[model samples]
Target: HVEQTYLMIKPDGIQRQVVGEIISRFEKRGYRIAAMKLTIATPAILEEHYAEHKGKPFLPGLIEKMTGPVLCMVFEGVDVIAQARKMMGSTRPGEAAPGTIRADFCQQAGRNLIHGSDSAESAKREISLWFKPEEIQSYKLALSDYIFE
Candidate 1:
């Protein structure tokens, strides 16, 4: 089942100059880039993006950290929600799998380098929150034939 998911390179990731490496990981795995942008996130956008975490203790710091420049992206492929999550690793870098982005690049939970939608429902919601309808591109990748089986 083809699907789309939102993936963001956090401020720490951009500061570390790993955005290209991070994107390469997804592209090398055959996911297609549907849309992408580098921008400074506004508090209003962060509030909406992290609405579920509104009352959490870490919400303030989270908003602060994410306010800086970061890369926002949408990736499309079969099972991309799960696939992207796997690639991103666990929310806690200490517990992330060895080959995951978090495990390889990050050391703390708060600065986990990347964010990937956890499920299809979350993917739909996140993508909609971050992207306007026309901002998402529709196209085919010739390599997909070999990648999707």
Candidate 2:
């Protein structure tokens, strides 16, 4: 089925100026950049976003680490949620695949270069948090019918 997912370049990645490179990768791979923006993340939003991780020891550090503007985007395509996860590589730096994003630019697990929705439920919940109804657009890509149908 066609799907959508949330993907973000975290503060470290934004600081490193890899946003374009990352977006280019998805674009090149035939996913649509359904929505995108650059903005600072607030602690309140982080708390809500990471509610599932609230009890973990790293939760405080996670909030502190994400204190800067991050690039948020919505990507759309068939199996996009899982596909983006694969393209993002391993959560831990040492385990990331050779050609994936994390292997190329990240150094650790919690500080890994990017964040992507790991499941369909996460994708829907995340997209709602980051975007308004009007912000996400729907249109036909010239080649989408051929590639996906």
Candidate 3:
């Protein structure tokens, strides 16, 4: 059931100082960090990543928010793509579950705090957009047996 997904802590997530907490939730749950980076997103990359939103009025402003430094990561685990999205909670914090990251840390939808790829195809595309082959590494986890059935 092992899988990979792209996850990101947006500028607001860092500015509000929950980066460590968010990461701990994933790590403590037995996920592996395949790749990670703290980088400023360029406009070029953002444009391509959000190409589907092209021609939309909110696109430019959305790209502006993402141009700041953000934590990008590739998380690996059992159905991590879906799992991470659940952990991230709903796009609107008001609709998010009680224990989810968004409900706990965010106040509104505009600054929903984190990004988790919405589907398998999106996971693959986002991961490639943010990480190169060499940046993503695979290794055996020490407590794999304890975590997986």
Candidate 4:
């Protein structure tokens, strides 16, 4: 089934200048970008985004990691959420599969540079949470035929 999921390149990712390569990975795999932005979020937003982390010890540092510019995105394709999660590998580089994003780009869990929504429910919550309706666009990809079939 076709799917849409929210993904982000955190401040560490931007600082490392891997945005271009990361985007290419999704595009090369036939995912289409539906929405995107480079924005610094407010506590109001992060509060909800990480609400479950409230009262956790790691929450403070996790919030700090996201306090600056982040490249937010929505990528669409068949089973993209699940596939993207696979592509992201484990959150810790030491535990991630080889060739996965986290494995290739980072050394520690703390610096692991990307975020992809974990499920359909998360996709919707993060999608609407981060984007205004007008910001998302849907269009045809000429290669969709070859990619899908």
Candidate 5:
């Protein structure tokens, strides 16, 4: 089945200048970049985005960290949520897989370089929260037919 997921390069990731590298990884894997933008996330949006973490001690720090500029994106492909999550590696940089984003670029829990939806349900909620209907574009890549069965 085709699926869509929300992914973001965190402020630290952008600051460290890995945006293109990260995007390249997804594209090379055959995922379509459906929507993308660079913006500073507002408190309201961050709260809604990280709603599940509300009332937790790390919430304030997370909000503060994300307040800076970020690259928000929606990627579409077969089994995107799980595929993207695997690409992202573990939330803890040290424990991430050797070839994964976190393992390659991050060194700490607080500074993990990217965010990806944990499941299909979260993907739907996050994509909605970050993008409007008109913001996402639909198109075909010549390689897509061969990529998806």
Candidate 6:
């Protein structure tokens, strides 16, 4: 099914200059970059974003790590969420599959290179968290007909 998924390159990924390479992977795989932006999130925003991680021992450091600039993107395509997750690989570099983004670019788990919304509900929550209502956009591409019915 056609869908939209939210994905983000965290502060570490942005600092490492892997944004273009990361986006290219998605584009090359037939996913559409529907929306994108670079922004430094407020602590309040990170707090809410990681609310589910609240009780974990790593939560404090995790929140601090996300305080800097992050590249947020919304992708559209068939099974985009699952595809993106597969592209992301495992959260830990050592555990990730060969040829996956994390396996190539990152090391740690909590500090893994990227974040992808795990479900349709997460996509909605994250899209709202990172973008204003008017900030998200939709449009047609010349190749749209070839990509989707």
lDDT (10s digit) by residue, model 3, range 22-134: 89999988999999999988899889889899999999899988888899999999989999999999999999999999999888887988999999999999998998978
Tens-place lDDT per residue, model 4, 19-92, is 99999999999899999999996677888888777989998888887888889999999999999999999988
Q: Which consecutive 10 residues in model 5 have the weakest lDDT in total?
A: 140-149
Model 3 Cα RMSD, Å? 0.9
Tens digits of per-residue lDDT for model 2, 1-149: 67899998899988888888999999987898889888899999888789899889999998999988899899898899999999999999789999889998887987787899999899889889878868898886788766775
Where's the lowest-lDDT run of ten residues in candidate 4?
Answer: 41-50
- Checking candidate 5 for backbone clashes, the offending pairs are none
User: What is the per-residue lDDT of model 6 for residues 40-131, given as tens digits with 9 covering 90 to 100?
Assistant: 97788998888788789987888888888999899889889988999899888889998999999878887787999998898899988888
TM-score of each: 0.96, 0.95, 0.96, 0.96, 0.96, 0.93
Candidate 1, residue 149: lDDT: 77
The residue pairs that clash in candidate 2, if any, are: none
Q: lDDT per residue, candidate 1, 88-145, as tens digits?
A: 8889999999999999998999999888998888888988888887889998998776
RMSD of each: 1.0, 1.2, 0.9, 0.9, 0.9, 1.4
Q: How far off is model 4, as Cα RMSD?
A: 0.9
Name the regions of candidate 4 deviating beyond 4 angstroms. none
Please list the C-alpha lDDT of all candidates, in the order they appear. Answer: 0.90, 0.88, 0.92, 0.90, 0.91, 0.87
What's the CA error at residue 67 for candidate 5, in Å? 0.8
lDDT of 6 at 86: 92
